[PDB]
Ligand binder design. Structure first.
Ligand code: B12
Ligand code: B12
Ligand SMILES: C[C@H]1O[C@@H](n2cnc3c(N)ncnc32)[C@H](O)[C@@H]1O
Ligand SMILES: C[C@H]1O[C@@H](n2cnc3c(N)ncnc32)[C@H](O)[C@@H]1O
Lengths: 227, 222
């Protein structure tokens, strides 16, 4: 009955894909979720475009609906678990560039619990042949700085959805930024928190990304690999 | 190393896991656990006598200033990733028709134990719906109305919102029973008698092993 899925894939009909991924996610259906993704990859849709044009829009909408009272916590929570599990499930299957000798250190700021974008980012990095160290969400800047001293990474990525602690962050940034520079590493930020110009001001950065596509453009210019 | 496996020298194994975890080295972490399993040690044993102790110690040392946040964060991601990786490489019982609904309470972010349990369930052939950590009690009930689970599992490490949970628990319990579900609780939060009192339950688990003993008595393998 359902080869109409396969017509959504061919047309690149993002809306229908979103709708079906949604139905799987809010229902806690890990397998239906991975299947939809798996099938769209082997149909030749790139992972990044799945991520930017199926997963991200769906989660935004889940949040818009939750806010308007059309959707409840339990449905987001299942969608969140499904998406974390399904993205990893797919990623373990993907081919990867050779190890590029480089180390990325990644996490989200203290008090922020939203970490799916972080996961999408770390995955992309691995596919490009980076070693990744995840501090995960809810990470103080001093903790970032400690880990930069310990590992001397080449890149620090921060995903930030929710930032309120402006004065603490203004204050810890100096030490963080100087540890980064002394180690010769670069800083890339993304996430909704940086729509606020005060937050963006604090988080002195080498590159602010809108999404994964332009992040990749940045990686290719800033950290090019031979062939 | 293979010496430590043969001897079953938990201490040596604990120490190597810790070294891998605080270094943020997922591959070494999985390697150790995988080698250990294939040297004859059940995964449950690895969970209880390697992962749990290493993580309780990370906490202790953090408290005493001997270990910093950055090192715990790394160990927690290593553990989440490592335990999932091993799980996917394990034999499972066939589906048993039964559904477990799993979560941690609202405002609690400690979620590794929940993963450890959910895994154990799937290996026993259960299907598992994960609400994840930081699940309001009413949000558990919402989900019991749908799905109609046979089991609800709750891991709790941090619980302080006593007056709310006290007043929300009535409806959640009603809903559980009128769907014939069972409630299993575990984790450090239930060492507090006021918390345990609110969380009317069918079994309280000390760890994973006795959890299995309870599942086999009450959910006899078809
Ligand atoms: C799922 C979710 C949660 C889950 C997350 C589970 C988890 N483990 O991650 C949980 C339950 C924790 C949660 C909690 C809350 N959240 Co919430 N929820 C979301 C939701 C629905 C989806 C988040 C998500 O995964 N987005 C997916 C990513 C991929 O989208 P994205 O962040 O836009 O990322 C893209 C780009 O920004 C970029 N990018 C992002 N980061 C980075 C980093 C780098 C380095 C680069 C290069 C690129 C990059 O690439 C991505 C793809 O192109 C959003 C809705 C939304 N708009 O996202 C809210 C939302 C962010 N949550 C919100 C709120 C209010 C809450 C709570 C305060 C609710 C409450 N308790 O009362 C709490 C706060 C907890 C905290 N302190 O962080 C609000 C925030 C609104 C606001 N800013 O005022 C939102 C917007 C929902 C809403 N519309 O109201 N939430
Ligand atoms: C990692 C960790 C964190 C991480 C969690 C990462 C993650 N995503 O899971 C983060 C950073 C989020 C964290 C934060 C905090 N936590 Co913390 N941290 C821990 C730590 C070190 C490990 C947790 C863990 O994975 N334990 C290992 C598990 C597998 O062991 P277990 O819970 O004993 O589970 C066993 C049994 O209980 C049973 N079980 C457990 N649950 C269930 C459920 C069911 C259904 C069943 C059948 C069985 C079962 O199975 C296991 C047997 O193998 C503990 C230390 C510790 N003692 O556990 C603290 C600890 C719990 N944290 C603590 C504190 C103080 C905090 C913070 C307040 C710190 C802060 N100021 O910010 C915050 C609070 C956040 C919150 N609201 O939840 C304290 C709590 C002390 C107390 N109760 O007062 C601890 C004990 C550390 C300490 N020594 O002081 N923490
Ligand atoms: C932004 C996301 O946060 C979740 N959310 C909203 N309020 C709570 C709460 N009290 N406890 C847990 N999660 C909550 C919703 O599911 C929403 O989609
Ligand atoms: C219980 C665990 O909580 C972590 N922890 C303690 N304080 C913070 C904080 N401000 N931000 C994030 N994690 C923290 C520590 O790593 C400890 O081991």
């Amino acid at each position: 009955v359902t080869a109409s899925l396969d017509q959504a894939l061919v047309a690149r009909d993002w809306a229908a894909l979103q709708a079906r991924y949604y139905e799987a996610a809010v229902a806690g259906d890990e397998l239906a979720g991975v299947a939809l993704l798996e099938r769209a990859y082997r149909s030749g849709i790139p992972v990044v475009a799945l991520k930017e044009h199926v997963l991200t829009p769906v989660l935004h909408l889940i949040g818009e609906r939750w806010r308007r009272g059309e959707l409840n916590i339990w449905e987001e929570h299942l969608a969140s678990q499904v998406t974390l599990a399904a993205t990893e499930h797919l990623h373990r299957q993907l081919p990867r560039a050779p190890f590029n000798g480089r180390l990325a250190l990644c996490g989200c700021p203290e008090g922020d619990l939203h970490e799916i974008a972080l996961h999408l980012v770390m995955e992309v990095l691995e596919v490009e042949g980076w070693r990744v160290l995840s501090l995960g969400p809810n990470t103080p800047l001093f903790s970032f700085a400690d880990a930069v001293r310990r590992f001397s990474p080449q890149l620090v990525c921060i995903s930030a959805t929710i930032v309120h602690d402006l004065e603490r962050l203004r204050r810890d940034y100096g030490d963080f930024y100087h540890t980064v520079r002394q180690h010769g590493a670069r800083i890339v930020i993304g996430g909704a928190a940086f729509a606020d110009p005060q937050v963006r001001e604090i988080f002195i950065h080498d590159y602010q990304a809108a999404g994964l596509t332009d992040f990749l453009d940045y990686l290719r210019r800033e950290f090019p690999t031979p062939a």
